[model samples]
Target: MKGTIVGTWIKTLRDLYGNDVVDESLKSVGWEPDRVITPLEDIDDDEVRRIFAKVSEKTGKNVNEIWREVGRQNIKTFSEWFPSYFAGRRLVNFLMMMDEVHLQLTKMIKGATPPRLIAKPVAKDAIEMEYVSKRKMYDYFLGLIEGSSKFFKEEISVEEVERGEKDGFSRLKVRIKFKNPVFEYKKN
Candidate 1:
């Protein structure tokens, strides 16, 4: 994973679980409590897993819970770092642009494998999104959708349509229904 995202995860963890828990979690994984993670750095996925495992053990919370909380809070950190992505965009637009954003962000990094965030409108008030990745971070994916709605002050209903692993890829398909109509017909 890129440190750009992992670094934000650390900040989000601190916000959600407090400084002590995050510090201890990092220290448990042989990382300095205050270590600085640069944006271009590539962090080992296993190391991140280890740190979160320690966090789970110390906080008496499951790993998925931690991930979901981190995902929700990480949006604020991302917004602070990359305001343009959120600026002047509705929640649905933001979600729809994620696949392109992910590709663009990692285009220069060799061997970087970002998740595919394919989303398409299924109705005037709903969209079907597919999360495909090798990492299998489904809880985080769902949490991010929830967080985006919260950030945009939009109410939405998410229903998981399917989830499974096939050919080494984890896939999650969801239907997101918005409170207000997102499409309109115009006479030309």
Candidate 2:
């Protein structure tokens, strides 16, 4: 996990809930109320998990819901920070390029274990995408997809197909269907 995302989470919490609630949540997790997180710093995932758990406890919300909300909100923040990725790209194109973006972004940091987003076109109006990582943030992954749809102004249907956790990795597969044909067929 990177502190960049965690810092955004903290700011988002403050923006949505207010400073008092975020301060209380941080205190509950034994974190400083005004800690500064550098965007490139690598932090323990468990620390983030604990912080979110405490936030959920304080807010009386489900942890999964919290993560999903964070994920949904993060798209706008991320786009603001990295406009090049979103600029001149449609929703489908943006999503399909995310795997490469994730790889490229994390490669510059030490100990950055970003998730793998594998998306493949299945039909003119559908695609099969898989989220693979040791960290099973399934809700967040789905939320990001939802956010992308909203950001792109394109309606989509997402269906989870599989969830597998074995050895030391997790994999979740989903079918994403667009409202209209977004791809062309070429006979090979």
Candidate 3:
């Protein structure tokens, strides 16, 4: 997963559950609660599920409920820290589309785990996205991309530019496109 997403997750945990719960959960996994979760690191989904389960068991909350609340609290922080994903007029719409993609892909993947995606515009009319996935969920992610394009009312293309293990993690790089002219307002 990208550091940004993991970072956001960490921040959200603290925000929703407070530092004590977050610290306790981190301790369960032998992680330093306040240390930064570095980028390109592979984390076991089951372990995360277990940790969230622990949180729920202790707090008498549902896993989905806890996750959703954490997400809600983190939106503002996430927007600030990852503004590229939230940049420009199409940003919120873009992320909402991505949220849909996440919903669709998560359903397809086993274990009820959703891959975290890091998307930023690589060009004015295109976004470069990296899907941090486990268990070969690429096709479902592609399906989501297709669905996202359809939802945005923009024709687009996706290109897989790279695939490799970097810094102990696997990553898939992609390029997204839009068919219509994307800019205006300048004249000679």
Candidate 4:
């Protein structure tokens, strides 16, 4: 994983939990309490897991709960850092463009393997989206979708269609039903 997202996670953790918990968690993982994670730095997956594990132990919250909270709050951070992606874009449009955005952002980074966010319109008011990755961060994925809805002020109902591992990759398909029609057939 890239430090860009991990750094945001640390910030979000401090926001949601507290600075003490985050600092302690980092120290438990042998990282400096005030470590500054550069954007392009490559973070080991195991290091991230150990840090989160310490956070879970300290906060008495399960790892998934922590991830969900971080994922939801991280959207606000992302908006602050990358406003262009959100400006003049509705919820559906933003969600649909995420796969390309991930690819574009990670293209130049060596060994970067970003999750695949493939979303397609299934109905005038709904879309089916798939989250595929080797890391299997499904709770975080769901939380990000929830955060997107909140950020756009759009009401949505999300249903998990399926989730499982196949061919060494974790896949989660979800149906997101919106309150209003986001798409319609039109004649040219």
Global local distance difference test of model 3: 0.63
Between prediction 2 and prediction 3, which has the larger lDDT? 2
Decoy 3 TM-score against native: 0.50
* Segments in model 1 whose C-alpha atoms lie over 4 Å from true places: 184-188
Ranked candidates (TM-score, high to low) = 4, 1, 2, 3
Comparing 2 with 4 on lDDT, the higher-scoring candidate is: 4
- Report the C-alpha lDDT of model 2 over 72-178, residue by residue, as the tens digit: 87787777877888888888898888899889878888767889998999999999999999999998899889988888889999999999997788999999999
User: How far off is model 3, as Cα RMSD?
Assistant: 11.4
Task: Please give the clash total of every predicted structure, in order.
Answer: 0, 0, 0, 0
- Candidate 4 per-residue lDDT, tens place, 5-47, comes to 8888888888898999989999988899889888889999889
C-alpha lDDT score of every prediction, in listed order? 0.91, 0.86, 0.63, 0.91
lDDT of 4 at 31: 94
Q: Write the per-residue lDDT of candidate 3 for residues 1-188, one digit (tens) a residue.
A: 33445677777777767788878887787778776765545566666666677787778897766765655455556556755655553532574356455556355434555556777655557667887755344543565455444433457777988876666556777887666545444564
TM-score of 4: 0.96
RMSD values, in order shown: 1.7, 1.5, 11.4, 1.3
TM-score of each: 0.96, 0.93, 0.50, 0.96
Q: What lDDT score is found at residue 42 in candidate 3? A: 51
Model 1, 70: alpha-carbon shift in Å? 0.7
